[PDB]
């Protein structure tokens, strides 16, 4: 019913967790961008470039800002855009980490009949599964369909919907 839109509060945390090998539970909103990176020189430069390409609005200090301040300030300027770097990472996970048969059109249509989600909540469910994807890839159509049912209940705490 009430599909959650592609806000910057959940899209920025999933993109930074995939490049630093983390999940949504470990990356807290009270931490900072430079304190959660670990302190490496290579990890600090890649986190600043990935956040500006997926949002658009580049601030002054992207690493010194916290997770709750940088994601909230970029939500007013973004209107649910797909992004240049965020669209390439989501399409590659459907072919490498998943098998042939569940593309972007089959994943968005399954959420409207088994959970009641349109195109707004379709991008949020696929972005949460890419940041916490396992090392074992799918090899059939039954493996990709089972991940969509489990993602509707685990990501329901940040949207507020039932099965």
């Amino acid at each position: 019913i009430a599909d959650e839109p592609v806000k910057a509060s959940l899209l920025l945390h999933v993109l930074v967790a995939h490049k630093l090998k983390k999940s949504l539970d470990s990356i807290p909103m009270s931490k900072t961008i430079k304190d959660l990176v670990g302190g490496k020189s290579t990890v600090q430069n890649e986190i600043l470039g990935d956040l500006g390409k997926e949002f658009g609005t580049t601030p002054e200090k992207p690493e010194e800002t916290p997770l709750e301040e940088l994601a909230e300030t970029f939500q007013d300027t973004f209107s649910g855009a797909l992004g240049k770097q965020s669209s390439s990472l989501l399409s590659r996970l459907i072919s490498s980490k998943m098998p042939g048969g569940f593309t972007i059109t089959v994943a968005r249509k399954y959420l409207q009949t088994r959970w009641g989600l349109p195109s707004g909540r379709q991008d949020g469910v696929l972005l949460v599964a890419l940041s916490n994807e396992p090392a074992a890839r799918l090899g059939s159509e039954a493996d990709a369909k089972a991940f969509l049912d489990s993602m509707a209940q685990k990501y329901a705490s940040i949207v507020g919907v039932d099965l």
Binding site: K21, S30, T32, D35, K40, S41, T42, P66, R92, S95, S96
Partner: protein
């Protein structure tokens, strides 16, 4: 517990008694005012601002500013927050992330018991000029002259490739290609990384100038690339090469300085091939003194993803290449740089990934490989596994490029880049 900016001269008159800050309620404003007061006081004093634990906004912003000041070199040695004591995990995390007291070459200096905390330490007077004599004497065989600049370029001497130096480098690198083979009645040429070892003496002179200084202990290899000329064969063992490059713009970064090097190669007067190098030096300095034509891809076509092993003893590998980095041999020089251990060299570790890419794609053939670029992100320690990877990049007029990705033990990107083959 009322004044805030009145401790600029009271703490420099002997010792800090009850120096607190109850008027500084700004997040970024309190950090900038504390740095300006330390420069106007005596060199060797102790400061220490107390955070406000009563408000939630002041305690969250003050904890992040205290962690960045401890890693830069501040005089904050005491921090006693108000509103009672903290929690069991809040008080324990501040003692491990911030070094406070409590709450509630040459190595000689004149000792003097008159400062208070420390007796005598290493002065910063001519620190870069005195430490440059130990690094220039391990590679350059001439006098130390800091009369160069980044706007000009000058080449060194020329050393011809001999058969004795190419035979010892093949057993230390581990490559059984057509160039590093031992067969009679057959002309054997050199590999892509064989000519860069002899020409590394002229490209490592980036810190020889007085304007291109910095931290010599943290001046590690950033990246290193190579590319062949258009329609040129590989060099054998008998011709010399030359390299001459400089830095056009201000080679700096947000946490230090950079270095832009681009060596070349000669072949009896005419050019042979080219190369590239990069160095990352830490510090804090800001003074300087057509369209889209790249290749693309349609799908991720993989080549190979085998594993390798780093060398445990880099004493015989660094001697045949002529590396100027003396902090990766003995354990005495590595303690001053505060690194994670005796890591491998930048040009020695990148040569193993470049030679192994042609053995899993071109069946160990140097006639098809022309370019080789490998950018080291992190440092790789000795005697450890190295997970290699390869992927298809793009074509370049009949020459399909191949990517590279070297991971660590904990699935960490330590080295990456992409090479060119055919």
């Amino acid at each position: 517990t009322v004044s805030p900016d009145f401790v600029a001269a009271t703490t420099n008159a002997g010792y800090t008694i009850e120096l607190a800050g109850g008027g500084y309620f700004s997040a970024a404003g309190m950090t900038a005012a504390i740095d300006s007061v330390v420069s106007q006081i005596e060199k060797g004093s102790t400061f220490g601002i107390n955070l406000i634990y009563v408000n939630p906004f002041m305690l969250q912003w003050g904890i992040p500013l205290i962690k960045e000041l401890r890693s830069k070199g501040y005089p904050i040695q005491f921090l006693t927050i108000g509103a009672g004591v903290p929690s069991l995990e809040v008080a324990s995390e501040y003692i491990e992330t911030l070094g406070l007291k409590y709450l509630g070459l040459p190595l000689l200096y004149n000792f003097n018991p008159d400062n208070g905390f420390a007796p005598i330490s290493e002065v910063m007077e001519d620190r870069n000029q005195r430490i440059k004599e130990m690094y220039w004497k391990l590679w350059i065989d001439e006098p130390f002259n800091l009369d160069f600049d980044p706007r000009d370029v000058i080449k060194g001497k020329d050393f011809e490739i001999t058969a004795k130096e190419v035979y010892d480098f093949t057993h230390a690198v581990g490559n059984n290609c057509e160039d590093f083979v031992s067969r009679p009645d057959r002309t054997m040429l050199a590999p892509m990384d064989f000519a860069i070892v002899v020409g590394w003496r002229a490209i490592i002179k980036a810190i020889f100038p007085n304007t291109v200084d910095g931290d010599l202990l943290k001046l590690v290899h950033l990246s290193n690339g190579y590319k062949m000329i258009p329609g040129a064969k590989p060099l054998q063992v008998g011709d010399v090469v030359s390299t001459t490059a400089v830095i056009e713009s201000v080679v700096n970064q947000p946490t230090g300085k950079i270095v832009d090097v681009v060596g070349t190669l000669s072949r009896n007067g005419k050019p042979v091939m080219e190369v590239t190098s990069s160095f990352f030096y830490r510090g804090n300095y800001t003074d300087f003194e057509t369209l889209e034509q790249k290749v693309n891809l349609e799908n991720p076509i993989p080549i190979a993803v085998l594993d390798s092993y780093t060398p445990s003893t880099n004493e015989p590998y660094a001697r045949v290449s002529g590396d100027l980095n003396p902090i990766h041999v003995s354990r005495h020089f590595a303690s001053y740089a505060n690194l994670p251990g005796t890591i491998t060299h930048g040009m020695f570790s990148s040569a193993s990934v470049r030679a192994l890419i042609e053995n899993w794609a071109a069946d160990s053939v140097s006639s098809r490989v022309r370019g080789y670029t490998c950018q080291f992100v992190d440092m790789v320690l000795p005697n450890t596994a190295l997970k290699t990877s390869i992927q298809h990049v793009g074509m370049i007029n009949g020459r399909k490029l191949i990517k590279f990705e070297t991971r660590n033990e904990d699935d960490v990107v330590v080295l990456t880049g992409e090479a060119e083959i055919e």
